[PDB]
């Protein structure tokens, strides 16, 4: 609630991911801006190692919930800003239905004026011509609701939600998300009553960009209380 003040106005973002899926190494670097007042994120991510061995949509969730818009009557339920600048750790298992599993570990914290997300991603059990490794996913991302609950004993929060990726053949590839977040610092944080975040994203491409990349526009709002 004191860290709320760091997200007035527009904040530069740096994202950095080191990944390994079924042995294929790759790095992603992203940069952009976030405006929590309007719950709006604009970012451009670039695969620095070459061609991205997975579809870009499967990395959206891994690639900064502190930029969500919490209505005034919900401010005391915003865990993510309360942890700043000191930051938080974010851990996920992402289980793709009848395909592999991603495991991710990340620090989200300020480094000066910039909010940084450093991620380590680990992927196993992907069938070499599934929807993921066989690049069979549409270049888009559907709207979702992320349900948050408190994790009082780790002084953090948890979330469970389902991501529905559109497959180029009309079917839908689903990805179960299990997530927990813990303060990095010792200072106090807001622990919340169960709410959800409602998200909407637009994916696009930079025509002047030759590297494999993703431009992303996100709008996130908190809801579900009183």
């Amino acid at each position, epitope marked *: 609630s004191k860290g709320e003040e760091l997200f007035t106005g527009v904040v530069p973002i740096l994202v950095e991911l080191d990944g390994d899926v079924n042995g294929h190494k790759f790095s992603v670097r992203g940069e952009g801006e976030g405006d929590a007042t309007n719950g709006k994120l604009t970012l451009k991510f670039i695969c620095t190692t070459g061609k991205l061995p997975v579809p870009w949509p499967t990395l959206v969730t891994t690639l900064v919930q502190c930029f969500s818009r919490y209505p005034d009557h919900m401010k005391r339920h915003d865990f993510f800003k309360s942890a700043m*600048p000191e930051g938080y750790v974010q851990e996920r298992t992402i289980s793709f239905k009848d395909d592999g599993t991603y495991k991710t570990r990340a620090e989200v914290k300020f480094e000066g004026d910039t909010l940084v997300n*450093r991620i380590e991603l680990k992927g196993i059990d992907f069938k070499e011509d599934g929807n993921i490794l066989g690049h069979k996913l549409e270049y888009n991302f559907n709207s979702h609701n992320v349900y948050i609950t408190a994790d009082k004993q780790k002084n953090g929060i948890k979330a469970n939600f389902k991501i529905r990726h559109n497959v180029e053949d009309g079917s839908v590839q689903l990805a179960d998300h299990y997530q927990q977040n813990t303060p990095i610092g010792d200072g106090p944080v807001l622990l919340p009553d169960n709410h959800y975040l409602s998200t909407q994203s637009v994916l696009s491409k930079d025509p002047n960009e030759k590297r494999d990349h993703m431009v992303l526009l996100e709008f996130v709002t908190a809801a579900g209380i009183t």
Partner: nanobody
Amino acid sequence: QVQLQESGGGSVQAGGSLRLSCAASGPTYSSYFMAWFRQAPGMEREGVAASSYDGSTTLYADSVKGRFTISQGNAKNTKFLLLNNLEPEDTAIYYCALRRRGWSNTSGWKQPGWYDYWGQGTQVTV
């Protein structure tokens, strides 16, 4: 959880130079703001030099007078502190400190409570 290799102390005559090392082994997604403090015999820990994770900000205390330089290491969270033009007043044990918590500014860098993980130090004698 996170561990601290520190190396490269020793002894010199007035004017000489030594290079301290420090590396942080831990989760490879973690970044640390890294510093060296030094403690004289019965005096307190004071700040010497400090540098952000990316080498983008580098800070020195008044006792340094542009004689000491931090340089970024080969690897992720590893750095060297080069001590030039050493004088007997610089004799002390030199502790590597790491800050994992995020930060908005570096005004606090000279306080030991700004950090999170400390070394055992190394001796530096002239």
